[PDB]
Structure 1
Amino acid sequence: FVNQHLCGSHLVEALYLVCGERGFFYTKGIVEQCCTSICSLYQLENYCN
């Protein structure tokens, strides 16, 4: 599960893009949620600060 590491890298970019200036909180956590099936941008707005 370098697979997990790789997914996590993309997830933080996606979080960055969705959340913008409010920023976000990153925990794996989230990755466990979003690396099995794709999380929508709508779903990602949920992890913004």
Structure 2
Amino acid sequence: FVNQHLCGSHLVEALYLVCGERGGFYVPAT
């Protein structure tokens, strides 16, 4: 992880890498 501008699916990816991989996710399936 590196701090940068993040949006859309790239934002969701960042949230997944930091916390979705800890099981803490609400998964916006689309």
Q: Same fold (TM over 0.5)?
A: no
| TM tier, smaller | 0.3 to 0.5
The structure in which a higher percent of residues are strand is 1
TM-score normalised to the size of structure 1?
0.31
- Higher Rg of the two aligned structures: 1
